Design an enzyme around this catalytic site. Structure first.
Site, PDB file in Angstrom:
ATOM      1  CG  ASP A  13      -3.836  -2.022  92.145  1.00 63.22           C
ATOM      2  OD1 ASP A  13      -3.538  -2.945  92.945  1.00 63.22           O
ATOM      3  OD2 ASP A  13      -3.180  -1.776  91.110  1.00 63.22           O
ATOM      4  CE  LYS A  16      -9.561  -6.807  95.235  1.00 66.86           C
ATOM      5  NZ  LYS A  16      -9.362  -5.566  94.417  1.00 66.86           N
ATOM      6  CB  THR A  17      -4.502  -6.403  99.833  1.00 64.86           C
ATOM      7  OG1 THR A  17      -4.870  -7.346  98.810  1.00 64.86           O
ATOM      8  CG2 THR A  17      -3.442  -7.030 100.742  1.00 64.86           C
ATOM      9  CG  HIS A  63      -6.635  -8.975  86.305  1.00 63.41           C
ATOM     10  ND1 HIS A  63      -7.192  -9.768  85.324  1.00 63.41           N
ATOM     11  CD2 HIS A  63      -5.957  -7.999  85.658  1.00 63.41           C
ATOM     12  CE1 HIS A  63      -6.867  -9.288  84.138  1.00 63.41           C
ATOM     13  NE2 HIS A  63      -6.119  -8.214  84.312  1.00 63.41           N
TER      14      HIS A  63
HETATM   15  N1  GNP Z   1      -4.225   7.064  99.134  1.00 64.64           N
HETATM   16  C1  GNP Z   1      -4.619   5.816  99.403  1.00 64.64           C
HETATM   17  N2  GNP Z   1      -4.019   4.751  98.788  1.00 64.64           N
HETATM   18  C2  GNP Z   1      -4.545   3.531  99.173  1.00 64.64           C
HETATM   19  C3  GNP Z   1      -5.568   3.285 100.079  1.00 64.64           C
HETATM   20  N3  GNP Z   1      -5.807   1.926 100.194  1.00 64.64           N
HETATM   21  C4  GNP Z   1      -4.951   1.373  99.386  1.00 64.64           C
HETATM   22  N4  GNP Z   1      -4.145   2.292  98.729  1.00 64.64           N
HETATM   23  C5  GNP Z   1      -3.073   2.046  97.751  1.00 64.64           C
HETATM   24  O1  GNP Z   1      -3.528   1.657  96.459  1.00 64.64           O
HETATM   25  C6  GNP Z   1      -2.780   0.475  96.012  1.00 64.64           C
HETATM   26  C7  GNP Z   1      -3.562  -0.818  95.925  1.00 64.64           C
HETATM   27  O2  GNP Z   1      -3.727  -1.387  97.233  1.00 64.64           O
HETATM   28  P1  GNP Z   1      -4.114  -2.909  97.487  1.00 64.64           P
HETATM   29  O3  GNP Z   1      -4.679  -3.051  98.865  1.00 64.64           O
HETATM   30  O4  GNP Z   1      -2.986  -3.857  97.186  1.00 64.64           O
HETATM   31  O5  GNP Z   1      -5.233  -3.114  96.372  1.00 64.64           O
HETATM   32  P2  GNP Z   1      -6.116  -4.396  95.986  1.00 64.64           P
HETATM   33  O6  GNP Z   1      -7.536  -3.937  95.776  1.00 64.64           O
HETATM   34  O7  GNP Z   1      -5.999  -5.475  97.045  1.00 64.64           O
HETATM   35  N5  GNP Z   1      -5.449  -4.897  94.569  1.00 64.64           N
HETATM   36  P3  GNP Z   1      -5.701  -6.349  93.753  1.00 64.64           P
HETATM   37  O8  GNP Z   1      -7.002  -6.278  93.083  1.00 64.64           O
HETATM   38  O9  GNP Z   1      -4.484  -6.712  92.944  1.00 64.64           O
HETATM   39  O10 GNP Z   1      -5.811  -7.404  94.832  1.00 64.64           O
HETATM   40  C8  GNP Z   1      -1.524   0.495  96.906  1.00 64.64           C
HETATM   41  O11 GNP Z   1      -0.481   1.295  96.352  1.00 64.64           O
HETATM   42  C9  GNP Z   1      -2.036   1.042  98.223  1.00 64.64           C
HETATM   43  O12 GNP Z   1      -1.094   1.593  99.110  1.00 64.64           O
HETATM   44  C10 GNP Z   1      -6.200   4.418 100.731  1.00 64.64           C
HETATM   45  O13 GNP Z   1      -7.112   4.392 101.556  1.00 64.64           O
HETATM   46  N6  GNP Z   1      -5.655   5.670 100.328  1.00 64.64           N
HETATM   47 MG    MG Z   2      -5.155  -7.246  96.653  1.00 62.72          MG
END
Ligand code: GNP
Ligand code: MG
Ligand code: ENX
EC number: 3.6.5.3
Length: 372
Positions: A13, A16-17, A63
């Site tokens: 979280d 990345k996505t 994860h």
């Molecule tokens: N405030 C803020 N929140 C962010 C930012 N980028 C992502 N988030 C938030 O943090 C969360 C995780 O985002 P996501 O892109 O899915 O994370 P990830 O690293 O891909 N997760 P995973 O490891 O499961 O793949 C979401 O609720 C998203 O909106 C940012 O620049 N600022």
């Molecule tokens: Mg992700």
């Protein structure tokens, strides 16, 4: 347009996505100026363009339960984007991904300090960057020369111009920091198969990155490895949002084959110029066993060790025979071992491979002599 393979890594979280999404939409909105989906058939695979380059991007889940999945990908990366939230700072999976990155040999790492929209302390940011650089240095990456971009993937994705500028800065570094990869275009065609999807009214299409050579529409090919070698003909080549007449070394594509059913081709096999590569089950190799220092085993293993051998896009179980007189192999030792796979894999002397077992990387070697 030179093709370059990158991707996102980092703790769960951290963003990345979202960053992946922000990159495609800001680049399309800024430099913006078909049912074709080669490698994009995979949800975590996107493609985008900068003014002078084309990128294939793999978005990896953070994860620990999913570390396997990213390995075959990181091993194919020309460079990687490490996402680190300014709030949390480096976390357990930030460490593991960097470690895996170093083990597989990812040549370059660029950092995107994410979620800076949530942080107003310039001192806090400086401190976090500092520890990201030290973390990178501890894993033998150029911590001090590492470009670090302070941004907000979310605000940028939502259209905030001030933050979108940071995405462009990041793209700038992909272009400048990662050197143009050299491609083995003058060698016989070879492509390791990752995904294999059927298209109604067309035949089967296999995707992957062309390791070397060129595959042109009309040319015949062989499917080598795992199953008994089959032969077919290339009826077409595609890429994200476009059809081509050729698949060149370094390019991520989809290759249409005639007269071959979806359930006859699987991940791990390779597509190749007829008679240029053979399937083997047994081989000799020079392998280096990671030390505990490098995240490898803490203890020695013995005859009959049965780990997983990673060859290109797949991995397969194998039994090890040790040198005469040798009873055990210690972590940190270099050794020659004869390996017997449970099934054939397309290979030749020089082919690199990794050894994984029990949730971690145990060795890195290369095929010395093919036997089978
Ligand atoms: N405030 C803020 N929140 C962010 C930012 N980028 C992502 N988030 C938030 O943090 C969360 C995780 O985002 P996501 O892109 O899915 O994370 P990830 O690293 O891909 N997760 P995973 O490891 O499961 O793949 C979401 O609720 C998203 O909106 C940012 O620049 N600022
Ligand atoms: Mg992700
Ligand atoms: C299809 C699969 C293809 C795989 C191949 O890819 C491709 N692309 O084909 C691989 Cl096979 C490449 O061909 C391999 C390659 O190129 C080689 O050059 C290898 O890269 C080289 C031999 C290795 Cl393996 C180097 C490892 C270096 C590790 C370091 C410097 C780790 C630092 C740890 C610091 C730390 O503090 O760790 C803590 C504590 C620690 C403890 O001490 O306890 C435990 C762990 C913790 O995190």
């Amino acid at each position: 347009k030179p093709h370059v393979n990158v991707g996102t890594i980092g703790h769960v979280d951290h963003g990345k996505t979202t960053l992946t999404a922000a990159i495609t939409t800001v680049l399309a909105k800024t430099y913006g100026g078909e049912k074709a989906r080669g490698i994009t058939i995979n949800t975590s695979h996107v493609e985008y363009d900068t003014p002078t380059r084309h990128y294939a991007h793999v978005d990896c889940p953070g994860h620990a339960d999913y570390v396997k999945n990213m390995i075959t990908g990181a091993a194919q990366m020309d460079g990687a984007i490490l996402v680190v939230a300014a709030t949390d700072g480096p976390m357990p999976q930030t460490r593991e991904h960097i470690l895996l990155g170093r083990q597989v040999g990812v040549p370059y790492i660029i950092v995107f300090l994410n979620k800076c929209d949530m942080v107003d302390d310039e001192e806090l940011l400086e401190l976090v960057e500092m520890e990201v650089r030290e973390l990178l240095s501890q894993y033998d990456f150029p911590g001090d020369d590492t470009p670090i971009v302070r941004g907000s993937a979310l605000k940028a994705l939502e259209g905030d111009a001030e933050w979108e500028a940071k995405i462009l800065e990041l793209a700038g570094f992909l272009d400048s920091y990662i050197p143009e990869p050299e491609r083995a275009i003058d060698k016989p065609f070879l492509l390791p198969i990752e995904d294999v999807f059927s298209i109604s009214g067309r035949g089967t299409v296999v995707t992957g990155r062309v390791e070397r050579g060129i595959i042109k529409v009309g040319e015949e090919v062989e499917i080598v490895g795992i199953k008994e070698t089959q032969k077919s003909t290339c009826t077409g080549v595609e890429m994200f949002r476009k059809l081509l007449d050729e698949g060149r070394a370094g390019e991520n594509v989809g290759v249409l084959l005639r007269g071959i059913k979806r359930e006859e081709i699987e991940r791990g096999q390779v597509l190749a110029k007829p008679g240029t590569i053979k399937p083997h089950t047994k081989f000799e190799s020079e392998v280096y066993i990671l030390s505990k220092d490098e995240g490898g085993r803490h203890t020695p293993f013995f005859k009959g060790y049965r780990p997983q051998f990673y060859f290109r896009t797949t991995d397969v179980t194998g039994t090890i025979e040790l040198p005469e007189g040798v009873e055990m192999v210690m972590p940190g030792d270099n050794i020659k071992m004869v390996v017997t796979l449970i099934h054939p894999i397309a290979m030749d002397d020089g082919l690199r491979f990794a050894i994984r077992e029990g949730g971690r990387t145990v060795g890195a070697g290369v095929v010395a002599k093919v036997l089978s």
